[PDB]
Amino acid sequence: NDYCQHFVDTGHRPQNFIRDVLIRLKDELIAKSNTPPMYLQADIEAFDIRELTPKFDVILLEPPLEEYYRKCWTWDDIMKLEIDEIAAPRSFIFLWCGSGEGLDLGRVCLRKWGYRRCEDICWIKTNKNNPKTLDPKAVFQRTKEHCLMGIKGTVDIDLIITEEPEIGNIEKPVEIFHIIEHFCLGRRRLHLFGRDSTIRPGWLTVGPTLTNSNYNAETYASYFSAPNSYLTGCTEEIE
Amino acid sequence: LFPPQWICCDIRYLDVSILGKFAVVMADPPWDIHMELPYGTLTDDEMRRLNIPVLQDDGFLFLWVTGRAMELGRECLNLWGYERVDEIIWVKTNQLQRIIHWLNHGKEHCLVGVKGNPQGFNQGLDCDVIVAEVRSTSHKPDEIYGMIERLSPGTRKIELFGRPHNVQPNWITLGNQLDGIHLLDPDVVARFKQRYPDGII
Numbered sequence A: 001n002d003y004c005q006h007f008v009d010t011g012h013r014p015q016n017f018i019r020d021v022l023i024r025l026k027d028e029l030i031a032k033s034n035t036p037p038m039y040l041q042a043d044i045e046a047f048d049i050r051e052l053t054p055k056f057d058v059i060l061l062e063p064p065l066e067e068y069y070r071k072c073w074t075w076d077d078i079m080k081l082e083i084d085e086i087a088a089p090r091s092f093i094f095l096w097c098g099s100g101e102g103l104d105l106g107r108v109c110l111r112k113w114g115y116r117r118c119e120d121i122c123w124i125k126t127n128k129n130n131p132k133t134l135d136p137k138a139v140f141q142r143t144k145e146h147c148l149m150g151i152k153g154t155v156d157i158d159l160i161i162t163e164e165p166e167i168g169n170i171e172k173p174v175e176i177f178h179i180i181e182h183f184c185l186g187r188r189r190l191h192l193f194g195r196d197s198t199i200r201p202g203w204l205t206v207g208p209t210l211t212n213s214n215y216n217a218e219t220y221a222s223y224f225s226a227p228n229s230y231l232t233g234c235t236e237e238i239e
Numbered sequence B: 001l002f003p004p005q006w007i008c009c010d011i012r013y014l015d016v017s018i019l020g021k022f023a024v025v026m027a028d029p030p031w032d033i034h035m036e037l038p039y040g041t042l043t044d045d046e047m048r049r050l051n052i053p054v055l056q057d058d059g060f061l062f063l064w065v066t067g068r069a070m071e072l073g074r075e076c077l078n079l080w081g082y083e084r085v086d087e088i089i090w091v092k093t094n095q096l097q098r099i100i101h102w103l104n105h106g107k108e109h110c111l112v113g114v115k116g117n118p119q120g121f122n123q124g125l126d127c128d129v130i131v132a133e134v135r136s137t138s139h140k141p142d143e144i145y146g147m148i149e150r151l152s153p154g155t156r157k158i159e160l161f162g163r164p165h166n167v168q169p170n171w172i173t174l175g176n177q178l179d180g181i182h183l184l185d186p187d188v189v190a191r192f193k194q195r196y197p198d199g200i201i
């Protein structure tokens, strides 16, 4: 069966026909280890990123690209963020890059901030409930988004499959958090350009549209002071 | 000359200037992916020096990449004069339509580059995800040839580092595991004889 010819014939994207699309104690150990959710309204363009301390084990970076809406951030804006100044010497980044020039400019950003790309996580969008306008340079219909994983310093698949969200809904699939947390990378986790709707235990969320804040740098640091400084987020709490 | 054509050769040493211009180029190169090699790889410098630029004036390049070739392939694409304008991923399934480092890999990547100003192509007919069953190792899915034919029907195409199962109408396939030389396009036959009179490269 040729699902590409089938898409041409019917408008059902090939991913519509993927099927099926216990590490449960790990999920409970992650939940037990999670810091309280903390969050801060901040205009990241005008904000001294160095105020966010301590340095982070994981950064999830979700800048609002113009292609999500068909204040947006260009790759010019994003590339000038001083991410290396808040990343721990051994740390990870997950950068949502969209499906256009971001696949190139996001890799430039990663190298500029001192990371090497280790995984390319693809969010593949089905259209089972509505079997598309085109970017001028596009050759094909764009039905996916990429989240690049970078590493600096010394159970899951690289695919997320969900239905294409309703127009104007810019949310990324919550499954990205599951993937990240299952890596057991450390407990200092930062989500830049998060929203009220993405706030989550175990994470510090920083974004312009947050309606409330509870962030306190001293209180936050206290979650990771000894004996808790090097926990992976996947082990038991220390008595 | 529409029917399949091929040239057994080492792509490092063949003079590709004799083949003319193509609307679509596809390559699945043996990148040096800094792992143990079941085949002979091309060094980064050899990949960079590939005479890709002579093969097209206006058209599309499909470049399969993996590992750190995701970055090196972008470099080569740009050095050869292309802008990357799409990226196809092939989601690997079994016969039951289920998906087969830090993460398990369910997919393969194919960069799409454009050179010049192609006109008369059918952009946007297909989408950028392929779902298809895995055949042999290192074997790409036949769906890509259909997408490429719908995008540019009837034009001349060339595949680099192809294998005998890859030979198709409208395509000239170059690879070191093909069966001799098989050429039917008269312009190509002429320039081949002129450049290789004793039939050896």
Ligand SMILES: O=C(NC[C@@]1(O)CCCN(c2cc(NCc3ccccc3)ncn2)C1)c1ccc(CN2CC3(CCC3)[C@@H]2C2CC2)cc1
Pocket (backbone or CB within 6 Å): B009, B010, B011, B012, B028, B029, B030, B031, B039, B040, B041, B042, B064, B065, B066, B108, B109, B137, B138, B139, B140, B141, B161, B162, B163, B174, B175, B176, B177
């Ligand atoms: O290499 C390879 N398969 C041996 C050949 O023989 C065969 C037939 C023509 N090939 C040549 C190679 C050549 N020079 C090479 C050389 C160097 C040093 C000494 C001797 C020969 N010249 C003319 N044709 C190579 C090779 C290359 C790439 C891949 C992986 N992709 C398969 C992929 C497609 C979807 C999955 C994946 C892709 C990244 C996403 C696997 C194997």
